[PDB]
Symmetry: C3
Subunit: 267 residues, 3 copies
Amino acid sequence: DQNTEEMENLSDRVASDKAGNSATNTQSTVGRLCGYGKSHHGEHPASCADTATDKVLAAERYYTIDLASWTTSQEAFSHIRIPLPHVLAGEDGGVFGATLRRHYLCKTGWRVQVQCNASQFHAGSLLVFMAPEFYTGKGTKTGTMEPSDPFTMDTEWRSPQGAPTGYRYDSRTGFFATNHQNQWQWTVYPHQILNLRTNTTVDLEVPYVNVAPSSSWTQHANWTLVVAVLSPLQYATGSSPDVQITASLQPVNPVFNGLRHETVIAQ
Amino acid sequence: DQNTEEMENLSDRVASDKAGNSATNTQSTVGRLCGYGKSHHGEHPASCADTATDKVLAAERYYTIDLASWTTSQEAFSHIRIPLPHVLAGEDGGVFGATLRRHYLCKTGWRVQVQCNASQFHAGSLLVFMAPEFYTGKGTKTGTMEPSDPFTMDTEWRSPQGAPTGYRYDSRTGFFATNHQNQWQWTVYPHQILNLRTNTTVDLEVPYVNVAPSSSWTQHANWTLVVAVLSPLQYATGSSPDVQITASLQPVNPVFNGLRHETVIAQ
Amino acid sequence: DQNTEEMENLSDRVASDKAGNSATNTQSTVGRLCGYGKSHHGEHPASCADTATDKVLAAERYYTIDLASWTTSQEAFSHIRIPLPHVLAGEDGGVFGATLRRHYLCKTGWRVQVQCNASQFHAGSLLVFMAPEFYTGKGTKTGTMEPSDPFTMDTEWRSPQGAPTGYRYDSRTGFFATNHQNQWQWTVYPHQILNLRTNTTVDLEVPYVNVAPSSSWTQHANWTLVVAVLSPLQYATGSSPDVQITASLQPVNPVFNGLRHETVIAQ
């Protein structure tokens, strides 16, 4: 189901989204999940007496960057996580990031687009889904208890472990931990599939939900994005192995308030 | 002509037929020949005073089985015949077959679907057509005159013979016989083509026509189905030779009457 | 953009043009440029008192012939020219050519169709465009000054020269000549692209424009057709190198006048 079409990628499968002074195109879409059912109204935080910095064009655009390389080698449910805000955080994050750390609080929603184009003699299936409270880390900390690098952008892929007991942490054992995940239910999150067969692209938009109408970006990361693979990349001797996966994102109608003087640290 | 579409098989080319508690699907159809122009009304045989066993759900479904293997080897107009009723006849024919031989007479029409899926780097063309009075046999009989096995389902394919003279039968010669066929006109029968190129499927429905409104299934077989090939299967060194041909059929609105006590023989 | 579609070539991309007793078909069109914006009305030359030979069916059809072979070897902007009228001129030009040289003057417009079909594992792009006053020749003349064979149909392809200075002509040098062309602007002419990828065909129709409403076909050729290539033919070891390029043309509503007695010469 969707319009008439293909070897080549056609019509009601060609979509475009313009935002700011950055404009996108895909000639082989299957939708765009507006995850949950509502978007984000630049509804001012009721929390603050701060009549904040609103409707700035300059930050409300599409920042694009590379996540990783997909290749024949990888095993199912191996995964790659992208926390928002903390990856659009500075340098690579335009005027958004700047105004982002000059301010105490933000409240935004994200509109994401992950791209991975192949060829009709390629098999595989990439699962893309946005989940708020989730896990990052990239580590078991040094020498003193608690837990390595959530802000880092998983440089390489992590190993589906024959068992949650969600990478607990201080030399121990017996039993599980509150960072569990059942990568086996990991399709209750607003998601969308990327089937080299069907899909060259996948668009997801998600509203604002933390514990407070606005949160602080120096200790939390309300949503982590996950580009982890559910049916690997077979390739027949001829053919383009190098399956370059790219992601391009857009904060939707952020509302910043609580302004001050350029946050200082990232190792 | 038919909707917009392809390498992949699309839209007004996706059809589904549900019957009983068996439901079909094809994503690369080209039609469905309602052969002759009328179907079969559960019109009760006027022949009998038997207010017969009608509208049974349980038998009015889609029985599926394998006919044969299509392969690079075969020559044009080589053929494979499937007599109805006598193949849905018992065991492999559900509640239809049972109620079929517990009854003296039937009157039905058939809705057939033969399937053979390939790949766009494959050439060939399969001709599928239903003809009532036709020929089966599978033989020149033993030692005494007349003619081997019509009820059998041609286990393997038979050889287009450089000439009808429709396999006459008692050591002879000079001249032809009433079981002729001009496989050269063998496209006057309700038919439909199966072009690996165009077609992955072919659907045919045919009404009731014998000599009597109801016939007896122990000496006649009013219709024989023929899955015989008109442009062979070339394959280029890589590629899936094994071209498995499958057929799935459905009796449409059979009307049985003249009931009694399980018919006895098949060698 | 254009209807839903492909590996195979579909629907609002299937066009047919019937003219006289010659009828065309293409299952992978992208348009038909009616170059300039107006066609040709059998508007009688106002120039002559000759109530000419009009609306003849027999000449107003599609003459088809082969121009050349496209192959992996050729370099960009290499070109092949087809002057009209002088190629439909006789023998190969039906009743048109005959009635053409039995008459002093003609006035017509052309409807052209150049065809070059390939395969989806082929890359390249053929530029097709009609320009009136242009250049032919096929030569630097013999021993006495001025300039080899405009009437000849470039038997083989000519070499894009690192510079117009439009093949001037009597042993010289320093500077350019009035037969310049900037094959670098050679897309201001009514044109149409032929992208093995997109295109298997290209249809162009052009009205009447000379210096006089009717011209004389023994000294001028008001339009030359050019089938010269802008992104060569790569082919991957398997595959049909032999890229046969064919052209089929039709004079639209010619109006002949000024009749006399079969023109005599062509070496």
